[PDB]
Ligand SMILES: Nc1ncnc2c1ncn2[C@@H]1O[C@H](COP(=O)(O)OP(=O)(O)OP(=O)(O)O)[C@@H](O)[C@H]1O
Ligand SMILES: Nc1ncnc2c1ncn2[C@@H]1O[C@H](COP(=O)(O)OP(=O)(O)OP(=O)(O)O)[C@@H](O)[C@H]1O
C-alpha cells in the first residue's frame with residue numbers, strides 16, 4: 001500500500017509512529033538516541049538507530065523507499081533543516097516536518113519541505129480559546145470567519161427546545177448535534193430536549209456564535 | 218478574569234501569546250531569564266521565578282489567579298511539585314502539560330484539574346492525515362461519530378451534491394463546501410463541487426471511510 | 434560603502450581587520466564578548482550581539498549596511514538563521530561563509546548573495562603546491578586556462594628568454610621574471626633567468642605542466 | 650610516488666587529503682576523532698585514528714616514511730605545536746603547518762616548521778579586496794607592488810576596443826586576457842571587442858591598476 005518513515009521519536013514523532021502502527025501501516029522509526037529506538041521497537045513496524053543528517057546512514061535505511069517521511073525534530077533546528085534538505089535532495093515525494101518557530105518554518109519552506117507543522121503553537125491557540133471562553137469544549141475552523149464549535153450547555157439551556165430557542169433564524173447559525181449523558185443525536189429535529197452539561201454542536205460565523213454564547217448562555 | 222502561564226515553552230509561550238492577543242490578563246512565569254525577557258512584550262507581565270519554591274510563587278501573588286497553566290512538559294519533577302503547590306494554595310483551575318502516561322498519573326493524583334498531551338494529541342491527528350491523504354482536518358464528537366474535512370479528488374469534479382448523495386447512500390451529511398476560498402455553509406442540493414474543494418462531511422467514522430473508498 | 438562583519442572568526446576577523454586598515458566603515462559583531470573587545474581597536478565599531486535574534490540585529494541598525502558578511506562557519510544553525518534574517522531585512526549584499534556542501538545548499542536556497550569556502554579553496558591551492566613543488570602560486574582564469582608563478586630550477590639557471598621559448602614551443606607566454614627581488618614585467622627576449630627566480634607563465638593548464646616536465 | 654600525510658582532518662586538512670587523493674597521490678589521513686577518519690576513509694589512500702601528540706602512535710603510522718606531512722590543526726595550539734615538534738624531531742623533510750594567529754606562527758617558526766599557512770587570514774584579505782573594490786573578481790600578487798588582477802567589465806567598457814582604450818601607453822599596465830560569454834582570448838591582439846560583464850585580466854603596478862579602475866571604469 002503506502003510506506004511511512006518517522007525520523008525523530010519525540011513526543012510528537014513517537015505519537016505518529018505509534019498511531020500509524022496501531023492503524024497497521026508500514027512505519028520505520030528512526031532516532032539517533034539508542035534508548036528511544038529500543039522503546040518504540042514494539043510500537044513500530046521497524047526501529048533503527050541512525051543519524052538522519054548523515055547521508056550514507058539515511059541510504060542504509062533505504063529512505064528512498066518511502067512515500068512519506070516525517071521529520072519530528074523540533075528542538076534542534078540544525079538537525080531538522082539538514083535532514084529535510086537530504087530528503088528533498090533524495091527525491092522523497094512527501095516530506096512533513098515539525099518546526100520550532102517562525103524562522104525555522106522559513107528555512108524549511110525554502111528547502112522544499114512539503115508540509116510544515118507547529119503542533120505546540122496550534123494546540124496552544126486552541127487551548128487558549130477554551131480557557132478564555134469556558135463554554136467552548138472543542139472546535140474546528142472551516143475558514144478564518146466560519147467555524148464549527150462544540151459547546152458545554154449551561155443551566156441557561158436546561159430543558160430547553162430547538163424549535164423554541166432557535167439559532168438559524170435568530171443568530172444565523174445551525175445546531176448539528178446534541179450529546180445527553182453520552183447518547184448522541186445527529187441532525188436533531190426540533191423540538192429536542194437539551195439538558196445542562198449537554199454537548200451542543202453549533203455551526204456558523206465565528207462572531208455569530210459568540211453572540212449566541214453571550215445572549216443565549 | 219486572570220491567567221498565569223508557568224513555563225514559557227513552545228506550548229506555554231503560545232498560550233500566553235494568544236491569551237494576550239485576545240487581551241486578557243496573563244502572567245508569564247519562567248525560571249529562565251532569557252525566556253521571560255522574550256515574552257515580556259507578549260504578556261500582560263513577565264517574571265523570573267522558580268515555580269517549585271513556595272515563597273517565590275507567593276511573591277507573584279499566584280493566589281490572585283483564576284486559571285494557572287503549568288506548561289512544563291520535559292521536567293516531571295518541576296511540573297509535579299509546581300502543580301502540588303498550586304493545589305495546596307487553593308487555585309481553582311490548574312491546567313498542566315504532561316510528558317507521558319506516568320506523568321499524567323502523578324498529576325491526576327495530586328489534583329490537576331485538566332491534563333493535556335499537546336504532542337500525543339497532535340500526533341494522532343497528523344497520523345490520520347498521513348494515512349488517509351484525503352482528510353485535511355477533523356474533530357471527534359465521540360469515539361464513533363466525527364466531523365471530517367476532506368479534500369475533493371477528481372472523482373468528484375463537477376459533481377452535484379444531491380446527485381452524489383452522502384445522506385441516503387452512506388448515512389452521512391455534507392455540511393459545507395469551499396471552492397476557491399468561497400464558503401457555502403449548509404449547502405442546498407444541487408451544488409457544484411470542483412476538484413480540490415474542501416468538503417465537510419459528518420456522521421459515523423466507519424461510514425465516512427466507506428464513502429472515501431467508494432465515492433472518492 | 435558600509436560593511437558589517439558578523440562573526441569575528443579567523444576569517445571574519447581578518448575581513449574586519451583588513452577593511453578597517455583600508456579605512457572603510459566596518460561594524461564588528463560577535464556574540465562572544467571577548468571577541469568584540471579584541472577587535473574593538475581594529476574596527477570602526479564593535480558590538481556584542483546575537484545575530485540570530487531579530488531585535489538585536491535591528492538595534493545595530495543592520496538595514497544601514499550595503500554589505501553584510503556572515504563569517505560563522507562552524508555553527509550551521511547560527512549561520513543559516515542570521516543570513517535568513519538579513520535577506521528578510523532586505524540587505525543588498527549578503528556574503529556568507531559555508532562549512533560544507535550541504536551548508537552551502539541551505540544558504541543558496543535562503544538567498545545568500547555570495548557563498549565562500551575559505552578553507553576548501555585554500556586547501557586545493559596548497560595541495561597543488563605540495564604535489565607540484567615548482568608552483569609557488571597561481572590564479573585560474575577558467576577551468577582550462579591559468580596563470581602560474583613558478584620557482585626556477587637549476588634547469589633554467591642563466592637561460593635566455595628567446596632561447597628557451599614557450600611562445601612557440603608550448604603555446605604559453607612568460608609574463609614576468611623576479612630575480613633577487615627585482616621585477617621585470619612583460620620581459621623582452623633575451624633576458625637572463627637565474628635559479629630560484631620567480632617565473633610567471635600563462636596558458637593552458639596541461640600545456641604549462643608539459644613545460645614543467647620537459648623544461649624544468 | 651611522493652608520499653603525503655595529512656594530520657588533522659579539518660575543513661582545511663580534509664580538503665588537502667581530498668584533493669591530493671583526487672590527483673591520485675599517496676595520502677595518509679590522520680585524526681584523533683574517529684568519526685572524522687571514517688568520513689575521509691573513501692577520500693584517502695588511508696585513514697587512521699591516531700593522537701598525533703603521542704610519539705609511539707606516530708611511529709605506528711610509520712610517519713618517518715613520509716616526504717611531506719601537513720598539520721592542519723588550527724584551533725588547538727597545544728596539539729599543533731607538539732605534533733610539529735615531534736615531526737621535526739623525527740626528521741621529516743617537509744612539515745607544513747596551519748597556524749591560528751601571529752603567536753602560534755611564532756611558536757611554529759621556532760620549532761622548525763618548514764612552511765606555515767594562515768588559510769583564513771589570507772582568504773580574508775583577498776575577499777576584503779573584492780568587497781571594497783566591487784570590480785576585482787580575483788587577483789594574484791607578484792610582489793608587494795606589482796599584481797595581476799581579474800576585473801569585471803562595467804558598461805563603461807561595453808563594445809570598446811583594445812588599442813582604442815589602451816593601457817600599455819596610458820596607464821603602464823598590460824591586458825592579458827578577455828573572457829566573453831565563457832570564450833577565452835589569451836594574449837589578445839588589438840583591436841578586440843570587450844562586452845559588459847567580460848572578465849578583463851590586467852597586469853602592472855597595484856596603484857596603476859586602481860587608477861585605470863577609477864578613470865577607465
Ligand atoms: N540527527 C538525528 N536523527 C534522528 N533523530 C534525531 C536526530 N537528532 C535528534 N533526534 C531525535 O529526534 C527526536 C526529536 O526530539 P527533539 O528533542 O530534538 O525535541 P522535540 O521535537 O521538541 O520533542 P517533542 O516532540 O516532544 O516536542 C529525539 O528523540 C531526538 O533524539
Ligand atoms: N522550576 C521551573 N519553574 C518555572 N518554569 C520552569 C521551571 N523549570 C523549567 N521551566 C521552564 O518551563 C518551560 C518548560 O519547558 P520544558 O522545556 O522543560 O519542556 P516542554 O514544556 O515540553 O517544551 P515545549 O512546550 O516547547 O514542548 C521551559 O521554558 C523551562 O525553562
Ligand SMILES: Nc1ncnc2c1ncn2[C@@H]1O[C@H](COP(=O)(O)OP(=O)(O)OP(=O)(O)O)[C@@H](O)[C@H]1O
Nearest residue numbers: 440441442443444463464465483484485505506507
Ligand atoms: N549568533 C551570533 N551572533 C554573532 N556572532 C556569533 C554568533 N554565533 C557565533 N558567533 C561568532 O561567530 C563565530 C562563529 O564561527 P566559527 O568561529 O565557530 O569559526 P569558523 O567560521 O568555522 O572558522 P574561523 O574561526 O577560522 O573563522 C565565532 O567567532 C562566534 O563567536
Ligand SMILES: Nc1ncnc2c1ncn2[C@@H]1O[C@H](COP(=O)(O)OP(=O)(O)OP(=O)(O)O)[C@@H](O)[C@H]1O
Nearest residue numbers: 657658659660661680681700701722723724725728
Ligand atoms: N592532537 C590531535 N591528534 C590528532 N588529531 C587531532 C588532534 N587535534 C585535533 N585533531 C583533529 O584535527 C582537526 C583539526 O581541526 P582544528 O579543529 O582543531 O581547528 P581548525 O584547524 O580551525 O579546523 P578547520 O580546518 O575547519 O579550519 C580536527 O578534526 C581534530 O579532530
